[PDB]
């Protein structure tokens, strides 16, 4: 019901159904808001299993996308108002929870925790780090292969000629841990990431440039129960 009110409150035009594959990559499919009804929540929507890597094979393609109404959150990037709803992948009819669905697996693990009675909740506080570049090029064919990385912060650009001049204040190799701007070129961006993360339900504890030259950065978020944290990741 909270979902049906969020649809009106934000004048939502679409609902973006999300899930994760075995490799860990978030996937999605979109339906007009008007396709969201009572049925939707109790029986979900049907989709082809055989399309995702490592899932159903030749014979048993069809499976169920079960919206988890607790996950509803507005997408801050899409042009038209759209609501994101994370889904679990259930076996049809049985509506059990696909053996290969990583979210189902994580839920099963939280269940088993409570079952053994060892504890009733698990707490995860992961600290993912990442890189921000300007140009990334790569390829591989019979005659060779390559990868080229480029960023305005890369130490290697200390010698690069730039259109409007090289302003040269860059983090040297392993020298990214905290020089204030302009050496650190990502303050504004790290904060937008923070604000947006919070608009999406995450709670931010800190943000800072990391060690590596060429844009290594980190946004630290507050822990949460295991499955909700993986969602947060």
């Amino acid at each position: 019901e909270h979902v049906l009110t969020m649809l009106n409150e934000h004048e939502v035009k679409f609902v973006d159904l999300r899930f994760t594959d075995t490799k860990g990559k978030e996937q999605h499919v979109t339906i007009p808001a008007h396709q969201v009804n009572a049925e939707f929540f109790e029986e979900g929507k049907m989709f082809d299993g055989s399309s995702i890597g490592g899932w159903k094979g030749i014979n048993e393609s069809d499976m169920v996308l079960m919206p988890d109404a607790s996950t509803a959150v507005i997408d801050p990037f899409f042009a038209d108002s759209t609501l994101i709803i994370r889904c679990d992948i259930l076996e049809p009819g049985t509506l059990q929870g696909y053996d290969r669905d990583p979210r189902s697996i994580a839920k099963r693990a939280e269940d088993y925790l409570r079952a053994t009675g060892i504890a009733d909740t698990v707490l995860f506080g992961p600290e993912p780090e990442f890189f921000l570049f300007d140009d990334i090029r790569f390829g591989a064919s019979i005659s060779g292969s390559h990868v080229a990385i480029d960023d305005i912060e890369g130490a290697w650009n200390s010698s690069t000629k730039y259109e409007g001049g090289n302003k040269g204040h860059r983090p040297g190799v392993k020298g990214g841990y905290f020089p204030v701007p302009p050496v650190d070129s990502a303050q504004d961006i790290r904060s937008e990431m923070c604000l947006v993360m919070e608009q999406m339900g995450l709670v931010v504890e800190a943000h800072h440039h990391e060690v590596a030259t060429a844009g290594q950065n980190e946004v630290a978020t507050r822990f949460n129960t295991m499955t909700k944290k993986a969602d947060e990741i």
């Binding site: 200390s158 040269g168 204040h169 040297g172 020089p179």
Partner: protein
């Protein structure tokens, strides 16, 4: 001189350009000019004997002389600021003022050879930038002063170089660490060169003045690396 001339000109004729600079590149070998020496009288090799590695006690005094006046010899055998970019705490750096028939940490190697007719010493720290004449002369005069004053060498170093060791901080004899230091040594320790009226004070002072002017260019001109290290200070 002829050697250099041939090298320079054959290179030119082949479309190349040769240099005898001691360290044109950081990160790879520099160019040295090891000097093998020995003395003789009426056809006999005054350096062969029953002492260490087949040496005469005369050879040892000679070595002692070279070691005593090493820093001053440096001003002639390593007459460029660049020379000291080769003579740096490295593994194979011929900077330890000692002798040995094996330890190639020692700036004085004793070639192990069969025929006593070929017994000699190898002073390793000289570089090709050195004035033939003045470098060789300074080496001799130091050797002679080592003899005239029976300057004993001490015992041969057969342990290791500059790094580990690092036990007793390994502060044993070493060659000059900069051109200025070498020039200053030459200034103070000039007696052994003036012996026999070979080198006059005027000559020595003039030489020092020529090199100080060179040393100044390098000391006064900002170095590219200084930008890497301090532009963002």
């Amino acid at each position: 001189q002829i050697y250099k001339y041939v090298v320079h000109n054959v290179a030119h004729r082949f479309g190349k350009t040769a240099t005898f600079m001691p360290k044109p590149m950081f990160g790879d070998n520099g160019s040295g000019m090891h000097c093998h020496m020995s003395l003789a009288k009426n056809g006999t090799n005054l350096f062969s004997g029953d002492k260490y590695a087949g040496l005469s006690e005369q050879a040892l005094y000679y070595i002692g002389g070279v070691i005593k006046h090493a820093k001053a010899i440096n001003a002639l055998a390593n007459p460029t600021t660049n020379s000291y970019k080769r003579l740096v705490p490295g593994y194979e750096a011929p900077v330890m003022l000692a002798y040995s028939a094996r330890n190639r940490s020692a700036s004085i190697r004793i070639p192990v050879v069969a025929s006593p007719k070929a017994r000699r010493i190898e002073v390793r720290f000289p570089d090709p930038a050195a004035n033939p004449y003045l470098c060789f002369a300074a080496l001799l005069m130091a050797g002679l002063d080592g003899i005239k004053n029976k300057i004993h060498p001490g015992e041969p170093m057969d342990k290791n170089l500059y790094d580990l060791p690092p036990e007793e901080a390994k502060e044993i004899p070493q060659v000059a660490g900069s051109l200025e230091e070498a020039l200053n040594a030459l200034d103070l320790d000039r007696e052994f060169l003036k012996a026999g009226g070979v080198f006059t004070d005027e000559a020595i002072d003039a030489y020092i003045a020529l090199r100080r002017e060179e040393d100044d260019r390098v000391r006064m001109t900002p170095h590219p690396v200084e930008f890497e290290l301090y532009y963002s200070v």
